Design a protein around this ligand. Structure first.
Ligand SMILES: [Ba+2]
Ligand SMILES: [Ba+2]
Length: 356
């Protein structure tokens, strides 16, 4: 029942950024525009220019550090805009939010708008664990307002103000996700036929996944139990190539399958970051400390797209496994997307959260 807008001022107070929201939805076909305003103090500002830089960049190294010669970085995308003087230009028409934000402020709140390309990677992070914190890495979208005579002139952290916006992926549902099968001979004439499938291709966070297990046991062997499990896969495509893998869900059913007998059952489990705080190597869609953080959404491949510049490729697979009294198994691919969200101005500090 209101219209909130986040904000964050520079260490001093001269510069102050305002934004409608932290996250920004990437509809694959197009990313939402970055609406914002920057309140400049004409006093110390002098005649020099006020810039605003949006920057997507792959980081690698200690989480905290950022010093050159230690922390690696690579700008996957950069966009500079001159908020003062207002430049020509114009050109992007002011949004309803930018207008009302200027009204509340006073003849020193200058608009700025970034249009993010579709092929860019979403926000993502990967904690290697305490064993080797230096292996940390991820993609990050920064927003940085500052003031200087030119884009070349070095900045000063007291002047500038750094925000960190996330770009979240999304895509509506809608054919039946193909099944997966495997015949295996266990010291027998006839094969044990394992088969499984899913009710959906695209799952959202917190949503339960239903696995349709169906097993024609044509052997004289007995299946003692069945392990269902969701598995994350994360490939590091920059600075230091590697492939992580980690179970985000597990369920061991002591369900048996008699020889020559058929079996069927729909299992259900839900991948959840809650059980992952003690996990090593795991792709998150944000910082581990924030509450609004979740498991990294699945990375969309664009057929001819360059997967190297994507920084980190995340993917997911359900895995059925029959523990024979050898072990038969299968793996079902599936997409994990971010849930769709489905008045007077009210300010709020840009800080995420950590509680508790
Ligand atoms: Ba096959
Ligand atoms: Ba259950």
């Amino acid at each position: 029942k209101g219209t909130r807008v986040f904000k964050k001022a520079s260490p001093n107070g001269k510069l102050t950024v305002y934004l409608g929201k932290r996250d920004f939805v990437d509809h694959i076909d197009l990313v939402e525009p970055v609406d914002g305003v920057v309140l400049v103090d004409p006093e110390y500002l002098k005649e020099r220019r006020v810039y605003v830089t949006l920057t997507c960049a792959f980081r690698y190294g200690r989480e905290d550090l950022d010093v050159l010669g230690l922390t690696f970085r690579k700008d996957l995308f950069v966009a500079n805009v001159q908020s003062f003087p207002p430049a020509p230009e114009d050109k992007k028409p002011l949004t309803r939010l930018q207008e009302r934000l200027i009204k509340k402020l006073g003849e020193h709140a200058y608009p700025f708008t970034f249009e993010i390309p579709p092929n860019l990677p979403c926000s993502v992070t990967l904690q290697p664990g305490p064993e080797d914190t230096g292996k940390a890495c991820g993609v990050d979208y920064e927003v940085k307002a500052f003031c200087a005579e030119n884009l070349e002139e070095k900045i000063h952290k007291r002047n500038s103000v750094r925000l960190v916006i996330r770009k979240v992926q999304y895509a509506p549902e809608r054919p039946q996700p193909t099944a997966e099968t495997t015949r295996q001979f266990l010291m027998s004439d006839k094969p044990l036929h394992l088969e499984a499938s899913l009710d959906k291709e695209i799952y959202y966070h917190g949503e339960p996944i239903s696995v349709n297990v169906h097993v024609t046991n044509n052997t004289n062997k007995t299946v003692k139990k069945i392990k269902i499990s969701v598995r994350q896969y994360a490939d590091i495509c920059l600075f230091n190539t590697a492939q992580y893998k980690c179970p985000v869900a597990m369920e061991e059913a002591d369900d048996t399958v008699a020889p020559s007998s058929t079996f069927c059952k729909v299992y259900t489990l839900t991948p959840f970051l809650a059980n992952n705080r003690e996990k090593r190597g795991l792709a998150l869609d944000g910082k581990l400390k924030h509450e609004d953080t979740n498991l990294a959404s699945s990375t969309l491949l664009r057929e001819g797209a360059n997967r190297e510049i994507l920084g980190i490729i995340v993917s997911y697979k359900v895995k059925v496994k029959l523990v024979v009294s050898s072990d038969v198994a299968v793996e079902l691919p599936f997409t994990l997307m971010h849930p769709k969200p489905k008045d007077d101005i009210v300010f709020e500090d840009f800080a995420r959260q950590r509680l508790k």
